[PDB]
Amino acid sequence: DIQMTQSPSSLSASVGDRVTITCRASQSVWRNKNVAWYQQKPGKAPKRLIYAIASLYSGVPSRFSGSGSGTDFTLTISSLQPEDFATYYCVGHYGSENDAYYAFGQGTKVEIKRTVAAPSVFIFPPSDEQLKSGTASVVCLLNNFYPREAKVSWYVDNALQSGNSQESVTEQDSKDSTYSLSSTLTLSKADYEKHKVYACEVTQGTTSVTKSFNRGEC
Amino acid sequence: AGXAG
Amino acid sequence: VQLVESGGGLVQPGGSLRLSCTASGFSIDSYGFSWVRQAPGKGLEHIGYLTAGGRAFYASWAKSRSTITRNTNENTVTLKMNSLRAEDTAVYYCAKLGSGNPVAIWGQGTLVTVSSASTKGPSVFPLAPSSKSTSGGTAALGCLVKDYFPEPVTVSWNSGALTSGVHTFPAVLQSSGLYSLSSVVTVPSSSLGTQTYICNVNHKPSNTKVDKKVEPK
């Protein structure tokens, strides 16, 4: 039935910037009053910031504020902080004395632009415990870097690997606004013990960093 | 009214 | 004032979910309550509203399969949804949304996974730090949490006493259809001989908890 469209769908802004997110309803909301704004941080439940278009919940910092009339609404973050990294949703109430409906906008992801930071790169051999099971996971960790885009390649005895690895990336850290990334190379025990040099190569811009180990040297 | 319906 | 949820977990396709929230500290007919869901990685979706007057209204997408009720004697509100498909996998919430009133109350949400696959506990392996660091006085260590189903697993370190520098990565679906994740932490290398580091892995869907001490070498 009802729709709500937020704009933009995502944005990047600097700490201290003023941020504005527009919400836009397909009908007039109940009493032209019932619009709230919610904030959802990674792996957390949504948290209400604003209700009744402009009332600020007592648990929320005063840099959040809302405005708007009828069918168009606005959330303003007056001085963006690292911990404001989140997806923001407007929610609207609708209906008559005989109808009751709620609709959510599609969400606006707010990302924090910060200065470039090179990752610390760590490489982990498979544990002896796992090798007994017949499988070998080699993990490469890229810790606390910015920006997010990075190319991570595996090399086993200087042969480039394809199709035997998976990546996972965190969301922006709520304190330093960096990312971390893991890449996991999965081989059988038989494959793992047939080679010596395991290397993970990380490329960002004009720099590549390679971390390696020689199987069984400690 | 606080809510609709 | 709380709104603890119950009734989630692994459900087979074609089956039904039944979810209930028990109001702790007030009467359920005091306020109107919504049911909301969020598929992994997606936005919030309103299922339906039970007005404090007792009339239930549903979004058009959900009217066919959904029934919301309340039991004043039970102090509970209930979502019933049938003919479940994979697209119904989501975290489900009961909440008074507070679009216009100062009161807003949310359950903690429970994941409902619609799948015919069986539950499987994780294997936990150490990601051990090297005895001598090669990263300027910082050591990385962690635990690899492999081959479990369904989600979620939670990881803490030293029973929650260690939070700074922890990264628990989002799980990845493996080609086996089982999940895997890692949780890592960076600590001062000088602490490796002194400080004990234990990852606490909880997989509530299989009623399995694993506590692993991660030692150098």
C26: domain CATH number is 2.60.40.10
Shared-domain flag, residues C82 and C141: no
Strands (DSSP E) found in C12-108: 17-24, 33-38, 45-50, 56-58, 66-71, 76-81, 90-96, 105-106
d(CA C214, CA C142): 7
Residue B1 with chain A: CB contacts under 8 Å: 31, 97
3-class DSSP state of C61 = helix
d(CA C205, CA C208): 8
Partner residue opposite B5 with nearest CB, options A31, A34, A100:
A100
Q: Give the distance, in angstroms, between the CA of residue A143 and the centroid of all CA atoms in the same chain.
A: 15
Chain C residue with the nearest C-alpha to that of A179: C167
Is A99's CB within 8 Å of B3's CB? Answer: no
* Domains observed in chain A: 4-113 (2.60.40.10), 120-214 (2.60.40.10)
**Are B5 and C49 in contact (CB < 8 Å)?**
yes
Chain B residue numbers touching C51 (CB-CB < 8 A): 3-5
Place of tokens 């520098």: C165
Strands (E), chain A: 4-7, 10-14, 19-25, 35-40, 47-51, 55-56, 64-69, 72-77, 86-94, 101-104, 108-113, 120-124, 135-145, 151-156, 159-160, 165-169, 179-188, 197-204, 207-214
Question: Cα distance from B5 to chain C (closest Cα, Å)?
Answer: 7
Same domain, C107 and C131: no
- Which DSSP string do the residues of A24-59 spell out, in sequence order? EESSPPGGGT-EEEEEE-TTS--EEEEETTTEEPTT
Residues C136 and C104 in one domain: no
Scan residues 17-36 of A and list those with Cβ closer than 8 Å to C: 29-31, 33-36
Domain extent for C8? 2-114
CB contact under 8 A, A97 and B3: no
Task: List Cβ neighbours of A39 (8 Å cut-off, separation of 6 or more).
Answer: A46, A47, A48, A49, A84, A86, A87, A88, A89
C123 touches chain A (CB under 8 A): yes
Residues of C in contact with B2 (CB under 8 A): 100-101
C25 with C72, same domain: the answer is: yes
Cβ distance A101 to B4 less than 8 Å, yes or no, reads yes
Question: How distant is the Cα of B2 from the closest Cα of chain A, in angstroms?
Answer: 9
What values do phi and psi take at A177, rounded to 5?
Answer: 60, 20
C114, C139, C159: which is the final residue of a domain?
A: C114
A51 to C99: CB separation less than 8 angstroms, yes or no: yes
Q: Which helix (H) or strand (E) holds C157?
A: strand C154-157
C69: its two tokens: 């009720």
Given a contact cutoff of 8 angstroms between Cβ atoms, the answer to whether C201 and C213 are in contact is no
Interface A-B, measured as beta-carbon pairs within 8 A, has a size of 21
CA distance A69 to A28: 9
Residues near C113 by beta carbon (within 8 Å), at least 6 away in sequence: C9, C10, C11, C89, C150, C151
User: What is the maximum alpha-carbon separation in chain B?
Assistant: 10
Residues C102 and C167 in one domain: no
CB A68 within 8 A of CB A16: no
Both tokens of residue C2? 């709380």
- 8 Å CB contact of A98 and B1: no
Experimental method, per PDB record: X-ray
Same domain? C128 vs C44: no
Picking from C58, C84, C114, the residue at the C-terminal end of a domain is C114
Neighbouring residues of C54: CB distance < 8 A, sequence distance ≥ 6: C29, C70
Contacts of A122 in chain C (CB under 8 A): 135, 140, 184
**Residue A70, Cβ density class (10 Å: 0-12 exposed, 13-18 middle, ≥19 buried):** exposed
Residues C102 and C192 in one domain: no
How does DSSP classify residue C149?
B
Chain C residues whose C-beta sits inside 8 Å of any chain B C-beta: 32, 49, 51-53, 55, 57, 100-101
Q: Are residues C72 and C90 in the same domain?
A: yes
Same domain, C110 and C127: no
- Cα–Cα distance between C71 and C50 in angstroms, integer? 12
Q: Are residues C139 and C105 located together in one domain of the fold?
A: no
- C164 shares contact with chain A (CB less than 8 Å): no
In angstroms, the CA A102 to CA A1 distance is: 10
- Are residues C163 and C203 both part of a single domain? yes
Q: Tell whether C132 and C58 lie within a shared domain.
A: no
Domain boundary among C70, C91, C114: C114
Domain count for chain C: 2
Q: What is the DSSP letter of C26?
A: S
Which tokens hold the place of A29?
A: 């909301």
